[PDB]
Design a protein around this ligand. Structure first.
Ligand SMILES: [Cl-]
Ligand SMILES: [Cl-]
Ligand SMILES: [Cl-]
Length: 124
């Protein structure tokens, strides 16, 4: 199987780049991270910061989650983030995504020991 922490790293971490390069970034990242292996993930976010920086968010501003869980945290400073969403013309296995780059505060759900991100709630 895949631990929650490892899944978050695969699905949302991207420290190799400082920002989404071109409009084909999401089509490639969603593919290479295996987010389109069995089906097209409708929406997914990538953070362009070190793993340490993203994990550090677990000890920053503790905010409520969308579902109501009290284990979400918001990064004190804005981070380089890329939002990948399926376009109107996307059908498995031909998944197509729209790349929307921006700098927003990352909000992640943390759990376990070490207390690391296991879910990406939103970006604000
Ligand atoms: Cl794993
Ligand atoms: Cl995988
Ligand atoms: Cl996401």
């Amino acid at each position: 199987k895949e631990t929650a922490a490892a899944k978050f790293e695969r699905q949302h971490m991207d420290s190799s780049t400082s920002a989404a390069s071109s409009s084909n970034y999401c089509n490639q990242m969603m593919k290479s991270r295996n987010l389109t292996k069995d089906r097209c993930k409708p929406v997914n976010t990538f953070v362009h910061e070190s793993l340490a920086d993203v994990q550090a968010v677990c000890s920053q501003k503790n905010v409520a989650c969308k579902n109501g869980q009290t284990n979400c945290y918001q990064s004190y400073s804005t981070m380089s983030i890329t939002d990948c969403r399926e376009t109107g013309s996307s059908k498995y296995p031909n998944c197509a995504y729209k790349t929307t780059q921006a700098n927003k505060h990352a909000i992640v759900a943390c759990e376990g020991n070490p207390y690391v991100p296991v879910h990406f709630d939103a970006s604000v």
